[PDB]
Write an enzyme that holds these catalytic residues in place. Structure first.
Site, PDB file in Angstrom:
ATOM      1  N   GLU A   1     -32.285  -2.269  41.917  1.00 12.64           N
ATOM      2  CA  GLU A   1     -30.849  -2.321  42.082  1.00 12.64           C
ATOM      3  C   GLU A   1     -30.193  -3.443  41.284  1.00 12.64           C
ATOM      4  OE1 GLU A   1     -28.800  -0.196  43.248  1.00 12.64           O
ATOM      5  OE2 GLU A   1     -30.203   1.123  44.275  1.00 12.64           O
TER       6      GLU A   1
ATOM      7  N   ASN B   1     -18.251   1.961  39.357  1.00 12.85           N
ATOM      8  CA  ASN B   1     -18.532   3.384  39.203  1.00 12.85           C
ATOM      9  C   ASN B   1     -17.194   4.001  38.829  1.00 12.85           C
ATOM     10  OD1 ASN B   1     -21.340   3.273  40.228  1.00 12.85           O
ATOM     11  ND2 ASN B   1     -20.347   2.687  42.154  1.00 12.85           N
TER      12      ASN B   1
ATOM     13  N   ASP C   1     -15.827   7.415  40.722  1.00 16.58           N
ATOM     14  CA  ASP C   1     -15.126   7.466  41.992  1.00 16.58           C
ATOM     15  C   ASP C   1     -14.380   6.190  42.322  1.00 16.58           C
ATOM     16  OD1 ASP C   1     -17.245   5.811  42.694  1.00 16.58           O
ATOM     17  OD2 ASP C   1     -17.642   6.843  44.567  1.00 16.58           O
TER      18      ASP C   1
ATOM     19  N   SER D   1     -15.426   3.059  42.795  1.00 15.62           N
ATOM     20  CA  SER D   1     -16.012   2.140  43.753  1.00 15.62           C
ATOM     21  C   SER D   1     -16.850   1.137  42.967  1.00 15.62           C
ATOM     22  CB  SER D   1     -16.848   2.894  44.804  1.00 15.62           C
ATOM     23  OG  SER D   1     -17.953   3.568  44.225  1.00 15.62           O
TER      24      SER D   1
ATOM     25  N   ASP E   1     -20.449  -1.514  43.236  1.00 14.90           N
ATOM     26  CA  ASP E   1     -21.662  -1.902  43.965  1.00 14.90           C
ATOM     27  C   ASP E   1     -21.764  -3.417  43.819  1.00 14.90           C
ATOM     28  OD1 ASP E   1     -22.423   0.759  44.532  1.00 14.90           O
ATOM     29  OD2 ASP E   1     -23.331   0.955  42.557  1.00 14.90           O
TER      30      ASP E   1
ATOM     31  N   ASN F   1     -22.187  -0.605  48.266  1.00 18.14           N
ATOM     32  CA  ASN F   1     -20.963   0.097  47.863  1.00 18.14           C
ATOM     33  C   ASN F   1     -19.687  -0.207  48.636  1.00 18.14           C
ATOM     34  OD1 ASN F   1     -19.245   2.908  47.738  1.00 18.14           O
ATOM     35  ND2 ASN F   1     -20.293   2.480  45.815  1.00 18.14           N
TER      36      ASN F   1
END
Length: 130
Positions: A35, A46, A49, A51, A53, A60
């Site tokens: 990750e 991202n 959409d 969002s 991380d 998220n």
């Protein structure tokens, strides 16, 4: 902060991650590695959409932490996403525990299925004394 492998292993154990909801420490280590590369300030937007991380576990903003700019977001963990970019990972760990309290468990992270699931993950904790 960028953790050294074993340093992180010991820290996660001390924080009660070993066997949390049936998830071994080796698995939490494999997740953090893919990750963020054990980097607490890793962020990933991202564009699809809208969002982001955040942190070592790439949590998220749509469901687990609040950053104000994510459309139709909720705060399951109830934290500011800012808390997940600290050098001290206590809040990131509490957030990660909340994510896996959902039925999907560790499978909530796509990266885990692709690079950890059904694999020999001993290598992540070998020689660390955990």
């Amino acid at each position: 902060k960028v953790f050294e492998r074993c340093e992180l292993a010991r820290t996660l154990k001390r924080l009660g991650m070993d066997g949390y909801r049936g998830i071994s420490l080796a698995n939490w280590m494999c997740l953090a590695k893919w990750e963020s590369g054990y980097n607490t300030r890793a962020t990933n937007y991202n564009a699809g959409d809208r969002s982001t991380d955040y942190g070592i576990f790439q949590i998220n903003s749509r469901y687990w932490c609040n950053d104000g700019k994510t459309p139709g977001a909720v705060n399951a963990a109830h934290l500011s996403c800012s808390a997940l970019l600290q050098d001290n990972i206590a809040d990131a760990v509490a957030a990660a525990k909340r994510v896996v309290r959902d039925p999907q468990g560790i499978r909530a992270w796509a990266a885990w299925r692709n690079r950890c699931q059904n694999r020999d993950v001993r290598q992540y904790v070998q020689g660390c004394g955990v």
